[model samples]
Target chain A: EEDLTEVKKDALENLRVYLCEKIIAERHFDHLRAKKILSREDTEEISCRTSSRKRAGKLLDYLQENPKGLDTLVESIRREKTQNFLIQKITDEVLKLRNIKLEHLK
Target chain B: EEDLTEVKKDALENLRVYLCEKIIAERHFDHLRAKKILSREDTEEISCRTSSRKRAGKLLDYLQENPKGLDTLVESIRREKTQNFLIQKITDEVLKLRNIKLEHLK
Candidate 1:
């Protein structure tokens, strides 16, 4: 339905995973590391999940503050119009919340 | 899964329905009334639903803007925490959203 499959799908998923990991790395690397050490059975796991949303929100807020970040999101959309599943999913999810406006923001 | 059933469920359901109806009533009453008068079929139906979400956002936003309104919600939450299933149901639902941070906000 969204024209994302095969190599395009894998690439998009990889990018999303990378972005999520990057966010985790920035603020909660120690917690994630402890989770890894403890075999994923500690408070770290919960903290990691919580941190992910915070980081996503942080990233979005950062973009909202800086015009360059906004331009990046918009340019990425235009450049990968046919196969950017990650961007589409995130953008659509934001719209569903109704708190954020992609059209005006972009 | 969150211990909501029977009368508790009904009260909560009633409140939710009322709240949704109230929001619909406040701003888009004319649109809704038009839908009814038009024999249950019209563009008014779509407008009514759309307006309901907007009204809900508006109400929540309004409550956030006023101390009394904030107290009203908190008081309701405390009162309804027992058999005030409306409070419990909404509390659980909002926690599931994980973005609003009710504990801190309250």
Candidate 2:
């Protein structure tokens, strides 16, 4: 139960590699900004990176600091017309973690 | 261009088989009704089907008559957490058909 942070972290970690490669980075950040998951300033900082890989890295790094970043990433990505494919893969990991936590209790 | 109906038909065809198997039918219809893509009476009629396969078949049958039904189906199905995966597959077919149409003009 105390592993809420741990769960989010693990979920992000599994998807992090794909996030760098698959995300159309700037488009996703717009969603993050609108959701208030990432700020205008933070997006600028992430945008400073020249490549999508770097931008995605910087963005995920910023997200790692937030309590609900992983959930927000899933929500924002889910809305995208092209990037929606990642949502299920990403959320499945979250569910897998929760199911493990349940198994731990049992 | 002239094949808008054909484009939607092809998109729906690629998705239809999977749809009957994959859709959580009622959940999707709720979205369709809200979007004005389906009627309350139509929903009730579809609801009368004995199983998901039957219900899904009837729903798609109804959609075939509407000019914008395929687009609405994509929009509605996109809202679903698990069903979002189909949007890419569905829309890709639409795009593919259009691409073919463009090729024909050349």
Candidate 3:
């Protein structure tokens, strides 16, 4: 049980960083900026939850506050690029943990 | 010459409204808010140029200021809907006039 909890924790942390870099940043320069704004520690702070759904919700709230962040994330999902792959992977992990599907902008 | 100019003006006006309603707003409530922020006169102010490319550039600038406006517009284009039809139509018109293609989010 303790090992499973650690695994979940690591997964959520990875998801948070991927979301920030691929979705929020969407470019190399923006990724650098996002790192400054949401460092590893910051992501740890934002996604401090055992439930994947709750973690995603907190991440969404953070994105909403930053101008164009939600939009960029949505666009990253819409585009047929590396970002889509990351979105799919993270979404699958979240679904496995929470049994809830993330809504993609269609 | 005068007739051609009038036709171009009317086309641009129609395009501006369509972009705001379908792309910028993306929902009934947001459409209402967009209407409040961007009335017919406001759209008129946005796409005042005779050239379609210049008009599109101006409209893009407007969307950039509003958070998620550009993302919504990009998503509208990505989705298979009447909005895509409008995007294609307007893009064709702009291409006919300027021989340039608008960049789609994908």
Candidate 4:
């Protein structure tokens, strides 16, 4: 019985760690890091919990329930790239306009 | 009466041009151009239509009703940027791995 409990505890701990790492790698951490939505202390607090499975379940649920949610996060990430490209294009256009204005002044 | 009709025609033509340009600028044309979904001849055919309003409406509708649609297109564009970033990161990591292997050889 003690061995079975230890095994289950180890499995739950591993599952928790795996889920957390996946979420972090997936850019779910981008806003979390930026906004401090889940502070380091909060993670530490969760980690210190006695029940590994319960702690892991809570953390997993929190990550899953994001506002503007997964779709919006994904869309925003895409927009961020396109926006960078647009900024570069706009900068070039602005320089061209300045050059044209300078020529007119001349 | 004829003047009002001409003005309405001009407005519709302008709206059509504006919408087309917006879609093109929005990268709606990216896949359309890639897949030959909207060919040069199709555009020309529409332009040749006697009813400017009708042609413009059809073109606008077509651009609006894309499969994978606007949300997906935007998401893909963002994903493209992230993919590029990830590729660069992966390349750097691979080079580090290769350097570690070379060090062992030394």
Q: In TM-score terms, which candidate is top? A: 2
The digit string of per-residue lDDT tens for model 2 on A3-105 reads: 5666566656755655533344354334344445456776676677656667666656666677655555455454443232244544555565566545556
lDDT of candidate 3 over B4-100, digit per residue (tens): 3333333344445554334322221122224324334545455444344444445444553443332333444553455555556645545432332
Off by over 4 Å in 3: A1-59, A63-88, A91-106, B1-14, B17-21, B24-74, B83-85, B96-106
- Give the Cα lDDT of each candidate: 0.35, 0.53, 0.40, 0.38
Compute each candidate's TM-score over C-alphas.
0.23, 0.40, 0.25, 0.21
**DockQ of all predictions against the true structure, Cα-based:** 0.03, 0.02, 0.01, 0.01
| Alpha carbon deviation, residue A106, candidate 1 (Å) | 17
What TM-score does chain B alone reach in each candidate, compared with the true chain B?
0.29, 0.63, 0.33, 0.28
Encode model 3's per-residue lDDT on A1-106: one tens digit a residue.
2234333433343344343334423332233345545547646655464234334434443553443333333444554556446567645555533332122211
Model 3 captures what fraction of native contacts? 0.00
Greater-DockQ candidate between 1 and 3: 1
Show where candidate 1 strays beyond 4 Å: A1-50, A74-82, A89-106, B1-88, B91-106
Model 2 segments beyond 4 Å from truth? A20-22, A28-35, A70-74, A77-80, A99-106, B1-106
Candidate 4, A10-48: lDDT as tens digits: 223323323322233223333343344554665666557
Q: Write the per-residue lDDT of candidate 1 for residues A31-67, one digit (tens) a residue.
A: 3332222234324444455435444433332332332
lDDT of 4 by residue, B7-104 (tens): 22233333344433233322222322222244345554654562545554655545533432233234334435344332343343233334443444
The per-candidate count of clashes, in order, stands at: 1, 0, 0, 1
Residue pairs in candidate 1 whose N, alpha carbon or C atoms collide under 3 angstroms: B80-B84
Whose lDDT is higher: candidate 1's or candidate 2's?
A: 2
Cα deviation of B13, candidate 3, in Å: 7.5
Q: Judge the docking of candidate 3 as incorrect, acceptable, medium or high.
A: incorrect
